[PDB]
Amino acid sequence: GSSGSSGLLYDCHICERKFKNELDRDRHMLVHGDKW
Ligand SMILES: [Zn+2]
């Protein structure tokens, strides 16, 4: 539905997660990519 109760814009394409900013999501993507 269309409700004004949410604070997540970015979403992960590995674990179907969701973050607030590209940072919280970006730093997370690392857990997936073998960049670490
Ligand atoms: Zn993920």
Curated annotation (Swiss-Prot):
Zinc finger, C2H2-type: residue spans? Answer: 10-32
* The name this protein goes by in its record: Zinc finger protein ZFAT
According to its UniProt entry, this protein's organism is: Homo sapiens
Q: Where in the cell is it found?
A: Nucleus; Cytoplasm, Cytosol
Purpose: May be involved in transcriptional regulation. Overexpression causes down-regulation of a number of genes involved in the immune response. Some genes are also up-regulated.
Annotated binding of Zn(2+) 5, by residue:
C12, C15, H28, H32
Q: In which tissues is it expressed?
A: Isoform 1 is strongly expressed in placenta, spleen, kidney, testis and peripheral blood leukocytes. Expressed in CD4+ and CD8+ T-cells, CD19+ B-cells and CB14+ monocytes. Isoform 3 is strongly expressed in placenta, ovary, tonsil, CD19+ B-cells and CD14+ monocytes.
